[PDB]
């Protein structure tokens, strides 16, 4: 900020004051579980079930 | 007595053409198409909830 001064007034500092802020890591994972019985199924049938 | 078409028993002149009055088609035949089926009842799979 800037200061108004008389003639022989003193100044004053006021200087810029900074900081850090910090990314947290976040490891986000989907598991998806079956039977293998679902797996042949799906392939011979061709339901789309594992593609979806 | 004098001679009237009364005595003659002219049939009618007949128009070409049937006037009807029109009728709404399928609505659900426009809105979704037709798929390929073989003769029964179908059965389809769907999503009930995600991962």
Same mark, same amino acid.
């Given at each position: 900020?800037?200061? +108004? +001064?008389?003639?022989? &007034?003193?100044?004053?500092? *006021?200087? &810029?004051?900074?900081?850090?802020?910090?990314? !947290?890591?976040?490891?986000?994972?989907?598991?998806? =579980?079956? *039977?293998?019985? +679902?797996?042949?199924?799906?392939? *011979?049938?061709? !339901?789309?079930?594992?593609?979806? | 007595?004098?001679?009237?078409? *009364?005595?003659?028993? !002219?049939? =009618?002149?007949?128009?070409?053409? +049937?006037?009807?009055? &029109?009728?709404?088609?399928?609505?659900?035949?426009?809105?979704?198409?037709?798929?390929?089926?073989?003769?029964?009842?179908?059965?389809?799979?769907?999503?009930?909830?995600?991962?």
């Amino acid at each position: 900020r800037g200061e +108004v +001064v008389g003639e022989s &007034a003193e100044k004053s500092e *006021s200087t &810029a004051t900074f900081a850090p802020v910090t990314s !947290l890591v976040r490891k986000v994972q989907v598991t998806q =579980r079956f *039977s293998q019985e +679902v797996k042949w199924a799906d392939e *011979s049938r061709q !339901l789309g079930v594992l593609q979806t | 007595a004098v001679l009237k078409t *009364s005595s003659f028993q !002219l049939p =009618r002149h007949l128009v070409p053409g +049937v006037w009807q009055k &029109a009728q709404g088609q399928s609505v659900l035949a426009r809105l979704s198409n037709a798929e390929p089926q073989e003769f029964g009842e179908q059965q389809y799979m769907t999503l009930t909830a995600p991962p």
